[PDB]
């Protein structure tokens, strides 16, 4: 009697994606920021006035962002498209307007619409022009419909704000100190200040440390200062356990040693211990009420809640001092994800505060001494301040908020347009707060808390392994709620007030504390009923479905989380060994009677947080459901991310293999969108004949990658041939490469600017310098047109000019000097298009699109969608390629020796599935934890007449005799990578050098030479090739001849010593230029090296 299984259960994922998923997160965050958060900030900073000249004020009424416009026209707005912005290298922003009212001369004057700045509008947002558009309108606007969007366009470059991952605020963290002292910490962060206060037991007693105190003071003194002076009450609040009292005894003894017994004495001591920023008593009370534990509110200098909080903290510290139940930082249940919305809100608030301060200062400086002419703000309302601030914060990526003391870097990154998959995977990345500070390995390790939230396998391979992560296929990030009805329901459910009873009740085993966003909400008994009723109410809908409730029995604490940034995942509710969702509900969803929102409302599917699933039980499949189950997994393959969703049959391969596969798919070559021809980027790679995979996954079908594939399916034969595939290399077919297989196109952009300087002069394009001998342009200016601009359709060679630009040198007749844009390239390139735009500064921007059609050759890198990266080892002809009975020759021959050590059975399964699919005219599915089984494909093969194991009778093409072993043929989806040998090839002659140190440059683009690092020097020393090392590091790198005076030992010039004013003891000497520079720097530092020369004999 097996439990019935709903087959259409997977249909819940498309419905969820229709309203949420990969890119909807940033879109919704930006929409909220521009719709509600901006208005709240404007309301908070609605009124600004100056101290001097009272009765003057500037009141803001309502702020608008409007639609995206361009300030190109002469004081005229015009709708501009994101593609036009990319082409013209401008920003895609909308004019921020506001309506204000002020008093010029005591007469109230109002303004209904005044611009104050420009906010870069995110693509596919609420106010974006791309939203609510059909594919036809997208084509008219020159934008791809499948484009994920959600990124900003500033100055033509596409920047994406990565999701920051930090620790949850207002939470006690018990952990070991540096030396190893188990203590506690709490970082109270409110809307104004953020203060971290710690508590240590270095000497058996609890010392509290804060950044505003001279020295850490005992906790009993703080207790006595916060109102509670009775040691009995303090001990009852700390705990009533024998071990608790034994551990707290030392603190009571140290407190009794001193004469501190009253609140006045305790406050006086705290004031004496307070640092400079009874007056001391007042400052101590103020710091205790506001500075210390800002998250704990005090009604009117009533420190009861704060006393209870510190008592619970001390109790947790005492309990941890025994059994090593130390909390871990890598537990994502205590992590928060700040989307671009919160960052933009903070930045806008800071910029608005700065603008208000500047306006108040200008008023204070202008109004009192200018003239009888009444001053108003409109004449100094800076409209470029906010615009430049936002532009810089989005472009440079460095955010420096002084009001919050936040100095972050790398917030924005250039959107990688290597491929559609690359862009879609980069859009859903997550950076960490660590940012490669230490090789801790803790946060870099894969924690079990990442189940269903982040992709376990998707991680960049390199130094950023473990710090950069990607979201799962099915997940959500919660926002902030009002917390009103939550508190109301908590108070109505019988939660006793903490101020009504003493702390002794906190030591009982059945009394459980209840916390609300780090703040002690109160106490409760029989928390099972409380949790059940809260969950039932949330399912009914009276409480927001995103409010999480968790229970920890080790500490007896029920946390109610309602802050934003928390990761949640949908789960089907299971009641009495039967899920709520049924085949009837799935059929209704498929027919369109209901949707995911209806499922959420009917108490069928609910969002669970990390802390909630920590206590709730989940089932993977229906057969796994037991009596003790509360939820059911929607789909297992959703655990993987977008980049990992391309892996066919990933559960049959190794983890490093999947990691390398994702890393190489992030660089895979293929089409970007339907507007890839009109798109002009600095570097683009396209494929000639891209083909969709035969073994495509449900994730592929969801992301619509089949419409924009990034690879081709080739008949690969797993075997060794010619020994040119020894280590991960592969052999390509000459005829296959000739018939168009693997053909790639490299598009580069060459931009030129003709700007007008301060003086009335402009850079001009000169015509082609025709040779009077032949009356034709010279070889360099051969590709130039009549206007001096290279025309499309022609080929460009090395050392050829594209724009014969000439700029003045004055900034009486102007003197123009030529600075043409020469083309640096080993191979020839063809000009596809030449776009000429004009900016508002009368500057002409010219962009020429160079194209290069390259053929796969020796050295090109290739992937097989399984991390089996290889390099083209040899290209053998078709006549040399083996042939089967049907006459099919393999295009790629891979090394079978790579399968044993890597356990890539997934590749064999994919090959067999693809063979069966191409034989039966079908598309097999390689869905993770499922998909087409091996028996089905074996049946297909035996029905179509081919071997049921892939191996087929093959005859050798060289000798013409059959092989003793059968060859494993089949179609595999190979994808070419951007790593090209033509681009990676480098050879450095003498070339140029650097000005400071006369040595070759670093980069290849700047014609740089290789570096014989310290390891190379060590290898040469170990070999003992003294003359080789000398010729390398002295003769061929920085050889130079200096003049040294044998009398003073200083460096001369032209055989003359200026120090001694003589030239008899001066002699030439070979010395490295770097060593000479070091000697000069030391002489400047006053460390004079006196060289005593002597004969070589």
């Amino acid at each position: 009697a097996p439990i019935p299984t709903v087959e259409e259960k997977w249909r819940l994922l498309p419905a969820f994606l229709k309203v949420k998923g990969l890119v909807k997160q940033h879109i919704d965050s930006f929409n909220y920021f521009i719709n509600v958060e901006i208005k709240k900030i404007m309301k908070a900073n609605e009124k600004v006035t100056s101290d001097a000249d009272p009765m003057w004020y500037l009141k803001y009424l309502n702020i608008y962002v409007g639609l995206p416009d361009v300030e190109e026209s002469f004081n005229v707005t015009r709708p501009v498209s994101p593609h036009e912005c990319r082409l013209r290298d401008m920003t895609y922003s909308a004019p921020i307007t506001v309506d204000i009212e002020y008093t010029r001369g005591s007469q109230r004057i109002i303004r209904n619409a005044l611009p104050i700045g420009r906010m870069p509008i995110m693509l596919r947002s609420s106010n974006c022009v791309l939203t609510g558009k059909t594919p036809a309108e997208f084509a008219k606007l020159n934008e791809c419909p499948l484009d994920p969007g959600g990124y900003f366009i500033v100055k033509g470059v596409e920047k994406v704000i990565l999701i920051q991952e930090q620790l949850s605020k207002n939470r006690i963290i018990v952990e070991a100190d540096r030396k190893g002292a188990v203590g506690a910490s709490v970082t109270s962060s409110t809307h104004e200040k953020k203060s971290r206060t710690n508590m240590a037991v270095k000497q058996g007693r609890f010392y509290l440390r804060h950044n505003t105190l001279s020295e850490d003071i005992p906790i009993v003194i703080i207790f006595k200062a916060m109102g509670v002076e009775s040691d009995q009450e303090i001990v009852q609040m700390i705990g009533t356990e024998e071990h608790v009292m034994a551990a707290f005894g030392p603190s009571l003894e140290e407190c009794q040693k001193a004469q501190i017994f009253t609140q006045m004495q305790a406050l006086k001591y705290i004031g004496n211990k307070v640092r400079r920023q009874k007056t001391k008593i007042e400052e101590a009370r103020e710091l205790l009420a506001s500075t210390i534990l800002t998250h704990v509110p005090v009604k009117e200098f009533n420190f009861r809640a704060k006393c209870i909080y510190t008592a619970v903290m001390v109790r947790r510290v005492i309990l941890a001092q025994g059994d090593n139940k130390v909390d871990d930082r890598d537990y994502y249940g205590n992590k928060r994800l700040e989307l671009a919305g919160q960052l933009l809100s903070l930045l806008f608030e800071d910029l608005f505060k700065k603008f208000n301060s500047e306006m108040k200062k200008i008023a204070d400086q202008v109004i009192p001494k200018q003239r009888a002419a009444q001053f108003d703000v409109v004449k100094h309302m800076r409209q470029d301040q906010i615009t430049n601030g936002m532009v810089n914060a989005i472009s440079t990526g460095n955010w420096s908020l002084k009001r919050f003391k936040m100095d972050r870097q790398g917030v924005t990154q250039v959107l990688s347009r290597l491929s559609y998959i690359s862009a879609l995977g980069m859009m859903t990345r997550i950076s960490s707060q660590f940012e490669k500070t230490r090789k801790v390995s803790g946060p870099r390790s894969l924690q079990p808390s990442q189940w269903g939230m982040l992709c376990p396998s998707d991680t960049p391979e390199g130094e950023a392994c473990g710090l950069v992560k990607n979201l799962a296929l099915m997940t959500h990030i919660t926002t902030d709620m009002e917390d009103g009805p939550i508190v109301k329901l908590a108070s109505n459910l019988g939660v006793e007030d903490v101020n009504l009873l003493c702390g002794e009740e906190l030591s009982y085993p059945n009394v459980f504390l209840v916390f609300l966003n780090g703040n002690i909400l109160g106490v409760i008994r029989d928390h099972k009923k409380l949790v059940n009723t809260f969950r039932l109410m949330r399912r009914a809908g009276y409480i927001n479905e995103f409010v999480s409730i968790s229970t920890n029995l080790t500490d007896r604490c029920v946390y109610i989380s309602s802050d934003g940034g928390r990761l949640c995942r949908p789960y089907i509710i299971v009641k009495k060994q039967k899920p709520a969702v049924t085949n009837k509900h799935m059929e209704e969803l498929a027919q369109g009677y209901r949707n995911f929102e209806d499922f959420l409302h009917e108490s069928l599917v609910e969002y669970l947080d990390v802390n909630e699933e920590n206590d709730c039980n989940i089932a993977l499949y229906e057969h796994t459901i037991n009596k003790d189950t509360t939820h059911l997994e929607i789909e297992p393959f959703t655990l993987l991310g977008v980049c990992a969703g391309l892996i066919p049959y990933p559960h049959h391969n190794q983890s490093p293999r999947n990691t390398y596969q994702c890393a190489m798919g992030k660089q895979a070559m293929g089409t970007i969108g339907y507007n890839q021809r009109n798109r002009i980027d600095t570097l683009m790679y396209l494929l000639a004949y891209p083909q969709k995979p035969m073994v495509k996954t449900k994730t592929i079908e969801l992301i619509e990658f089949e419409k924009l594939p990034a690879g081709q399916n080739a008949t690969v034969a797993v075997m060794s041939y010619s020994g040119y595939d020894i280590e991960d290399a592969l052999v390509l077919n000459k005829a296959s490469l000739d018939r168009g297989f693997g053909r790639c196109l490299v598009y580069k952009n060459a931009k030129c600017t003709l700007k007008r300087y301060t003086n009335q002069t402009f850079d001009k394009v000169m015509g082609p310098m025709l040779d009077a001998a032949t009356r034709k342009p010279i070889w360099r200016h051969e590709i130039l047109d009549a206007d001096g601009i290279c025309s499309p359709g022609e080929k460009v060679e090395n050392k050829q000019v594209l724009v014969n630009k000439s700029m003045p040198t004055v900034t009486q007749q102007p003197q123009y000097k030529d600075v043409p844009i020469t083309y640096k390239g080993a191979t020839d390139s063809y000009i596809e298009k030449v776009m000429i735009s004009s900016n508002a500064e009368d500057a002409f921007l010219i962009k020429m699109l160079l194209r290069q059609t390259r053929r796969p050759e020796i050295g090109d890198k290739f992937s097989s969608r399984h991390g089996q990266k290889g390099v083209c080892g040899l290209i053998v002809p078709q006549e040399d390629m083996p042939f089967c009975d049907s006459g099919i020759c393999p295009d790629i021959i891979m090394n079978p020796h790579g399968f044993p050590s890597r356990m890539t059975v997934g590749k064999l399964i994919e090959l067999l599935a693809g063979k069966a699919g191409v034989l039966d005219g079908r598309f097999h599915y390689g869905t993770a934890f499922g998909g087409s089984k091996v028996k089905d494909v074996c049946e297909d093969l035996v029905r179509h007449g081919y071997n049921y194991l892939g191996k087929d009778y093959v005859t050798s093409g060289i000798t013409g005799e059959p092989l003793e072993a059968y060859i494993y043929f089949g179609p595999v989806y190979y994808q070419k990578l951007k790593h090209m040998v033509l681009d990676k090839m480098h050879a450095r002659a003498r070339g140029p050098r650097a000005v400071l140190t006369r040595q070759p440059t670093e980069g290849r683009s700047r014609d740089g030479g290789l570096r014989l690092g310290e390891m190379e020097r060590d290898c040469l020393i170990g070999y003992g090739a003294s003359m080789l090392l000398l010729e390398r590091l002295m003769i061929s790198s920085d050889a130079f001849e200096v003049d040294v005076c044998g009398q003073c030992g200083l460096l001369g010039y032209s055989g003359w010593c200026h120090y001694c004013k003589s030239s008899c003891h001066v002699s030439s000497l070979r010395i490295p230029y770097a060593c000479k520079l070091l000697f000069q720097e030391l002489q400047s530092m006053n460390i004079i090296p006196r060289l005593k020369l002597s004969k070589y004999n």
Partner: protein, 65 residues
């Protein structure tokens, strides 16, 4: 972008059968029987015609025209 004229493995002329395969798709013929009627016995041409994506019209929709 566009259906290749030659097949990668063997080299049989397949670009001339793209419109015929599209017509068979518009008709009631399935992928398997359509590829069988088109005369593609070996699986290389079947894969070439089945795994091919038609993006030429998607690019012409953006073409200047």
């Amino acid at each position: 972008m566009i259906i290749p004229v030659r097949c990668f493995t063997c080299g049989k002329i397949v670009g001339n059968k793209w419109e015929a395969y599209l017509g068979l798709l518009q008709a009631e013929y399935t992928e398997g029987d359509a590829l069988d009627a088109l005369g593609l016995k070996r699986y290389c041409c079947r894969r070439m015609l089945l795994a091919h994506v038609d993006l030429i019209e998607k690019l012409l929709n953006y073409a200047p025209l």
